[PDB]
Amino acid sequence: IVSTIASHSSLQILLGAKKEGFKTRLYVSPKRRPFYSSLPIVDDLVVAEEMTSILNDDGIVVPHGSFVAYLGIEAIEKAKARFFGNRRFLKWETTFELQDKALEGAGIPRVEVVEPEDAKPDELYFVRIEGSELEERLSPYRVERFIPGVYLYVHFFYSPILERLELLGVDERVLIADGNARWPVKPLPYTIVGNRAIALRESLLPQLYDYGLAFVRTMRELEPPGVIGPFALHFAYDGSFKAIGIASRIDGGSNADHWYSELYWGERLSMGRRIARELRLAEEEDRLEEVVT
Amino acid sequence: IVSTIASHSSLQILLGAKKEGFKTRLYVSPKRRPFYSSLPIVDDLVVAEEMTSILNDDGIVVPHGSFVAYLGIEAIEKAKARFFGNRRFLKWETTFELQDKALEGAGIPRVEVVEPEDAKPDELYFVRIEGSELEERLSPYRVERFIPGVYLYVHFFYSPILERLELLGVDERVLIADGNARWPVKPLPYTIVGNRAIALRESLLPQLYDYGLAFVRTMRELEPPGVIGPFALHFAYDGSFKAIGIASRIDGGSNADHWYSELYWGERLSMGRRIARELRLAEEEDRLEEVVT
Amino acid sequence: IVSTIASHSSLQILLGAKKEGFKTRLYVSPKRRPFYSSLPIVDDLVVAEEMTSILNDDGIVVPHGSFVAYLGIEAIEKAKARFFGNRRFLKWETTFELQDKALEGAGIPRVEVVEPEDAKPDELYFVRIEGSELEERLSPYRVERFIPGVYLYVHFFYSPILERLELLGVDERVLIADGNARWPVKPLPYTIVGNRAIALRESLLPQLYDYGLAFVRTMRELEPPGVIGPFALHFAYDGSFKAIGIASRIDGGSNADHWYSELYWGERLSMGRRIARELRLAEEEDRLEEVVT
Numbered sequence A, B, C: 001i002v003s004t005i006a007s008h009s010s011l012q013i014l015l016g017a018k019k020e021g022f023k024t025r026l027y028v029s030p031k032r033r034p035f036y037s038s039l040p041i042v043d044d045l046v047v048a049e050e051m052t053s054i055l056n057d058d059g060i061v062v063p064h065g066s067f068v069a070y071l072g073i074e075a076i077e078k079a080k081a082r083f084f085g086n087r088r089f090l091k092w093e094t095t096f097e098l099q100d101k102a103l104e105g106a107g108i109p110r111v112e113v114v115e116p117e118d119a120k121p122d123e124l125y126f127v128r129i130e131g132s133e134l135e136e137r138l139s140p141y142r143v144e145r146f147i148p149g150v151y152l153y154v155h156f157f158y159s160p161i162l163e164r165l166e167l168l169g170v171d172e173r174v175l176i177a178d179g180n181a182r183w184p185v186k187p188l189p190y191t192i193v194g195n196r197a198i199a200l201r202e203s204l205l206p207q208l209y210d211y212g213l214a215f216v217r218t219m220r221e222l223e224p225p226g227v228i229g230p231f232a233l234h235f236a237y238d239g240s241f242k243a244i245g246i247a248s249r250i251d252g253g254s255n256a257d258h259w260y261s262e263l264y265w266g267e268r269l270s271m272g273r274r275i276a277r278e279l280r281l282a283e284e285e286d287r288l289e290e291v292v293t
């Protein structure tokens, strides 16, 4: 019943499914299977050179941050497989156009875009789609105002079965851009290595919830059913929140150990387990149409 | 029975109370209530422009880091409401005078104070009540020796019902002073955004426990009953501990996911839940006078 | 039955043992016993000036990172006490010779060694057994290429009773070399103060598992039974993994709150509890010879 590609957050996903009593199926490549085959959370392990076998019947596919990189956006939207939570939404985090449209539509403050009209020098900027340059600026992308100050990744789960928006965690990325923390040397790459669970100052959560609620509303318009399971808003905290992006699926920073879900449930429960519980709840109520695609 | 202001650590507090079987009441403002009303952990939700409605009968108020900012110290000490753990103690973290008196009285090493007798330049200093300056020094506060090196926030819970001091966690603040970690730019504000739970090197805990025990002793003198529930000692680890402050109530870094409590209990249990269990234990033993005010 | 020295990770160890139903015995010094005697997880508390009382019969000693510093390597290998997981292995993390031998034997990439043939200046290096210098280089050790970029400590548990390698967590050290993260000042000491649990990007785990499997294989040769319980590989992530060291016993970064174990078990379970469950499994199957020394 529950299957997905081996990478990104399939561990969290499968463990949560096997936890909710569902059966497990993982599509993995020959190089990566040694590790995953040693895991007691996988029942059916489908080894393959390519993951394009998205004809996975029977089960619900449950996407993550590797699906587009392993399969085009086209293939997925026209895929035969069942799929968890909308599916037309997945593309909304893929381009600036869609990302802006939604964030603007929700009223969420975003980092300002900068077209070559700097303040050379000592006026550095961030170049997205990364890397940051100074005055010069000479050398598909966008230029943004450089903002120093903790980057927070808020995880949400809107549930149709319960008709509520759940703020389930706040992540902080572990970038290779460290080793400067100990002793700064030169600009390093912003590639993520891992994620740190962080307990946000409580006085900021209400604001994020409002932004989240607004996001759900406009997405319900902009893309018919609009946001069924997990999603994330990415922010730069200046001391005034500016949105830098979104996650149209389980973010990844959700692999970190967040609590919060304990606010809606008696038990902890991760994002991957939340998705599975959403599935199980739909089953027991003949819903299940409201959460898939 | 259990109520408190919506902010700081009311989430942790209410969840822990509802976990110990207590009833829940939250005082929240109109702007922040959307978020909190969607939480299954609140039973009675008292919306209000101002929180000055501290006539809350029936229940136990349970204070946190917002109470003085929402209500003066005067009002609270003369408040009518029941209140968890002492109450005269809450003011001891409010001024240098009280902070020093207690820390000195407990024999705890504190960061040295510096009156304009620098070592200009490259001799930077920290200015409290923040911000750090260099040589110049020109431009209610105190000047302290600048100390680089992990800032640890130790959480304690002295319980009368059990007559023991519990070391329940060690927090690390997430400041906006980051984004320098990746690439240093300029001195940033030290405002906290969140908290990270950290497993301290075990060889350092005994020392902290000793300082904690001593703190309880002198507070039992300096302020009659002295320290009934949660409190925290703030340190700068040079490789030799220097106290920089204290928390005369639930600190906030306690929102992070700490274990430790598992050393006194079979189960995890947060600080907010610890306060509630203290309450329930008192109830079942007709104590309850020993833990309130 | 289960005893060990009070420091490093004895808290984790004892709690896990008391959790698996085992009895607990802690050897502690007079100065540190106040703290440990207040802990409900210790049954028999053996106070002593020196820990050289390694004649501990009845129980299984379970070593950690303080054993060699409290007792020589000689004494331990010829010790009378029972001891958990091999014991001849414990010395393999003690010297470069052994560390290299093993890492080379497993085909694990290691940080390159540098003999005075720098690139003075701005070409800084790390000096192990710490501290980092620049061009000059003038002033038992080794010199390594300086590498900036998150240091990861992977925790493993090879179990004979189950004949499998378990990747149970990834730690990140909290060094005093911080306070530079907020605002860089001067090169600080790399002494650890604590540990942060980190959820590693899932695409990197398979690679570490492979290195781990290989480590087990060669250790099974290089040191007869080779690696029975916990061990750790230390890396520098450049974006291409370079080994900097190993832990021939429970690492310490295992005191942090890791999940992962939930992949092999339905429950969380720490490393200290993992060692204890290994013991209990052996008991129930008359094995117990396969996991002790």
Ligand SMILES: Nc1ncnc2c1ncn2[C@@H]1O[C@H](COP(=O)(O)OP(=O)(O)OP(=O)(O)O)[C@@H](O)[C@H]1O
Pocket (backbone or CB within 6 Å): A111, A126, A130, A144, A145, A146, A147, A148, A151, A173, A175, A190, A234, A236, A244, A245, B179, B182
């Ligand atoms: N406007 C900005 N100013 C300064 N730094 C920034 C800015 N935007 C992003 N960053 C840096 O990059 C990090 C966030 O990267 P981000 O999560 O946006 O990458 P990404 O969009 O997920 O990459 P991809 O689109 O390929 O998945 C932060 O840690 C931050 O330090």
Ligand SMILES: Nc1ncnc2c1ncn2[C@@H]1O[C@H](COP(=O)(O)OP(=O)(O)OP(=O)(O)O)[C@@H](O)[C@H]1O
Pocket (backbone or CB within 6 Å): B111, B125, B126, B129, B130, B144, B145, B146, B147, B148, B151, B173, B175, B190, B234, B236, B244, B245, C179, C182
């Ligand atoms: N003596 C010092 N030297 C260098 N940095 C310091 C010093 N004291 C504090 N800091 C910095 O500030 C942070 C601690 O701030 P702190 O917790 O003392 O603020 P605060 O007292 O809680 O503010 P408030 O009193 O309004 O609640 C640390 O992260 C540290 O980097």
Ligand SMILES: Nc1ncnc2c1ncn2[C@@H]1O[C@H](COP(=O)(O)OP(=O)(O)OP(=O)(O)O)[C@@H](O)[C@H]1O
Pocket (backbone or CB within 6 Å): A182, C111, C125, C126, C129, C130, C144, C145, C146, C147, C148, C151, C173, C175, C190, C234, C236, C244, C245
């Ligand atoms: N090759 C290197 N280049 C740059 N920094 C390094 C290098 N090796 C180690 N470090 C720094 O030191 C830290 C790792 O220290 P490490 O864990 O190797 O000490 P240690 O070997 O455990 O000390 P001990 O042997 O006494 O137990 C990292 O945080 C990293 O910043």
